[PDB]
Amino acid sequence: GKLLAQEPTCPRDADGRPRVFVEGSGAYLTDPDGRRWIDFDNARGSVVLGHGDEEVAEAIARAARGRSGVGTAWSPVLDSLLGQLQEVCGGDVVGLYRTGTAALRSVTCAVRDARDRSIVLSSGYHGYDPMWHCDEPFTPNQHGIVEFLFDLDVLAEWLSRPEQVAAVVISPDHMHLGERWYTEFTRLTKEADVPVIADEVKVGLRYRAGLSTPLLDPAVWIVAKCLANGSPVAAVGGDAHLLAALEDVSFTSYFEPTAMAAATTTLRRMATGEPQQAIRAAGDRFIAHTRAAFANAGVPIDLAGNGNLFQFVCADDEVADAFHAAAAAEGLLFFEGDNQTPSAAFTDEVVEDACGRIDRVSAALTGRFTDRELTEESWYASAWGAMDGLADRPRTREETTAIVERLW
Amino acid sequence: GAGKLLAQEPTCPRDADGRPRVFVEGSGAYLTDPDGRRWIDFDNARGSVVLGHGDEEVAEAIARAARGRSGVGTAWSPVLDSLLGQLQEVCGGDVVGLYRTGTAALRSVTCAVRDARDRSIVLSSGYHGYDPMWHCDEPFTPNQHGIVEFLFDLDVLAEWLSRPEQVAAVVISPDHMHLGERWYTEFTRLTKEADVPVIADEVKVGLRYRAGLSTPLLDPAVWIVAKCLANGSPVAAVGGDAHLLAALEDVSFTSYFEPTAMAAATTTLRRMATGEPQQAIRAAGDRFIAHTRAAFANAGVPIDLAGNGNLFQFVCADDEVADAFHAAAAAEGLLFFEGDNQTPSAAFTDEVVEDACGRIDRVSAALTGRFTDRELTEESWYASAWGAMDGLADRPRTREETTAIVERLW
Ligand SMILES: Cc1ncc(COP(=O)(O)O)c(CNC[C@H]2O[C@H](O[C@H]3[C@H](O)[C@@H](O)[C@H](N)C[C@@H]3N)[C@H](N)[C@@H](O)[C@@H]2O)c1O
Ligand SMILES: Cc1ncc(COP(=O)(O)O)c(CNC[C@H]2O[C@H](O[C@H]3[C@H](O)[C@@H](O)[C@H](N)C[C@@H]3N)[C@H](N)[C@@H](O)[C@@H]2O)c1O
């Protein structure tokens, strides 16, 4: 760790040190003491089938033995993958990358080049690349990117001179943005006649066998986390003209057969919609059980989202700190301060286990914070962590300014 | 099947009409096409398969990792400690980091070094990946991103390094076929005198020749390796000076702890750290090179070979010879990385070497009598270096002749 220059997002203890897990299977991880934990983090939501899913593993092992193509060259598995992507997501053309970061940078640069226009309006996280960094919201960074924090009043201001705007790129959230938000988003962008890049790295295939909302009409999409059960594959597709500059993309590992095996195998399953409905059902039991447990002990922690993708909304940082300590004590591995994303290995027995552990958390919290209330502050702070901008709750510009001051 | 759906144009073996060649299986140094015909691979996923297709030790490690047996993607595991320790031991440096492509690593470190140096200009030679930050319309002046392409010309470099308060870094992809020892000593001198840090892009050459970076005649502040790290699995690594790499604290990606890639890199690096694979490849490749030189000389075929058994290149008299050579090679099932470098893997062992020598004899026969009169010229050498190393071959010229030679080749 001393040696590592980077700071990977991962589970960390109270001291900030990465939590070590030495094996895992399905929904369960094992720590170096042999204790078993239930994983709701699941490699930031990229393990959707379950750790060690055997169908994926068999495919990867066959590919590792050279039976399913070579890294040197095109293979039939690639044809199958590209075909599957276009059937499920749509679009004229498709492309592949190793990370969501890479996919988002490449498509944003390509669409900007095709549009010959300098400004990109953005909300949501799009990866680690410095092109997205900015010192303040609502004004262009040095790369021409304007963060609008899912504020449609700001978006409307920017779209009021739409000829300088190349694209609008958003990472759709469905915990804190509803049908009204999407209807207005799409109204605005269609009025401006500016293309939409839907960054569905997290939500594409998450809820259903396809992109997350028919309320967006994207010119370009990206999916990744739900594509390959954690193997490093991201895909993009959409309009051929907008993605013309993708002709310049090539990378050494393009034909690597294990990644292709993982993606073809996982996509075949996700395209049925079965895993997503299993996960929704099981997650929904856990959320219903947890919401009740907490309500009845007077613990000031609510939940947002659904079985596929949910989050805890704590009254304050003190509640949250105590909640995380108690959860870790019961071996519940949540993505702290962010979204929870069960896999298809979160089955009914695991739900029963997890519900026991959350009874024990609720007991560990009872009587301590009863005098505390979930306020609008709690909600905005929680949403900010999980979806990387402002919740769709009614507000004036003065309020928007005050919330940003608190959370930036 | 799906060519028309694909927005990208991946580098891959293509037939004479530009259509990608399909291969269904591989094993060691051999590929199998859809009709079962067996080809010998010298391309090896652009030199990233260094142990051989389907290497069993790597395969077992990947398979176990795929069942979660040494860790999961959610979290840190002991395998990561092993890999980071191994990397620092073999390549050196204060700190290390991991990426999924050479492209990603090169962009991240370049941006980080520039940030640390508070200087906007970066001098560059060699290929560093597909990112648009490297695109330019002309050499020798800065592109839109502050990057000056210098095409391995030390006259141009020295002019830029006379601005030491403006130049953040010099990033080079070292070549050892078309740049001599004298080039490297002048390069290191210029950069030391200017006190400008060197980023050694060793994505191709790092661990290629020995258990370490490719030349002691460089002293880089930052290194990148990748192709020799994981037998094709998508892993790149960086390391070096902690201050210069401070901005890497901002890097995280979802698949960081993905266990199959980590298994491949740890297992492959353990072998490459011994130097044994590189020694085996050098011997076998050197036998092949010796045989091919003699065969072409015997047949009056005007193609020279540069490099060594780890990494070599064909230098054809001209493009008609090269096209004819490639068509003849494909007809014998030799798969070369056309116009670029050849990089055998450690599965290119003695019986495979014998097979490949046979195929080369047949190539020589198919070329005999067709080009006997033609000769390599300096233009042959320039053209070949421009393809394999992405810059100007190290051969005497005036500053005025550089300009002319670039017009020709740009
Ligand atoms: C929509 C979207 N687009 C591109 C990417 C980049 O993909 P990749 O990680 O493969 O490069 C992500 C990667 N997702 C990782 C996390 O990102 C955000 O969280 C953090 C992220 O964990 C952290 O690394 C970063 N420094 C700040 C950022 N706010 C989200 N809130 C979280 O739900 C996600 O799991 C994404 O969610
Ligand atoms: C030094 C160096 N640094 C970063 C990279 C990028 O790594 P990655 O492909 O993992 O993103 C490479 C990737 N190497 C692929 C090839 O690139 C170059 O050739 C082509 C490259 O194959 C091609 O894709 C590109 N469009 C033009 C480029 N000139 C080299 N001559 C070749 O020996 C290489 O095998 C490299 O060699």
Automatic annotation (TrEMBL), chain A:
The family line of this record is: Belongs to the class-III pyridoxal-phosphate-dependent aminotransferase family.
- Residues where N6-(pyridoxal phosphate)lysine (covalent) is found: 225
Which of this chain's residues are annotated to bind Mg(2+)? 338
Source species: Micromonospora echinospora (Micromonospora purpurea)
Keyword ATP-binding listed? The answer is no
- Which InterPro entries does the entry mention? Aminotrans_3, PyrdxlP-dep_Trfase, PyrdxlP-dep_Trfase_major, PyrdxlP-dep_Trfase_small
User: Could you say which cofactors this protein requires?
Assistant: pyridoxal 5'-phosphate
Please list the residues that bind pyridoxal 5'-phosphate. Answer: 100-101, 252
State whether keyword Protein biosynthesis applies: no
This protein's source sits in the domain of life called: Bacteria
Q: Which Pfam families does this chain map to?
A: Aminotran_3
Native organism taxonomy: Bacteria, Bacillati, Actinomycetota, Actinomycetes, Micromonosporales
- Can you name this protein? C-6' aminotransferase
List the GO molecular function terms.
Answer: metal ion binding; pyridoxal phosphate binding; transaminase activity
Keyword vocabulary terms for this entry: Aminotransferase, Metal-binding, Pyridoxal phosphate, Transferase
TrEMBL record, chain B:
Q: Give the UniProt family note.
A: Belongs to the class-III pyridoxal-phosphate-dependent aminotransferase family.
Binding-site list for pyridoxal 5'-phosphate:
102-103, 254
Give GO terms: molecular function aspect only.
Answer: metal ion binding; pyridoxal phosphate binding; transaminase activity
InterPro entries tied to this protein: Aminotrans_3, PyrdxlP-dep_Trfase, PyrdxlP-dep_Trfase_major, PyrdxlP-dep_Trfase_small
Cofactor annotation: pyridoxal 5'-phosphate
- Give residues annotated as binding Mg(2+): 340
Which residues does this entry mark as bearing N6-(pyridoxal phosphate)lysine (covalent)? Answer: 227
* Name of this protein: C-6' aminotransferase
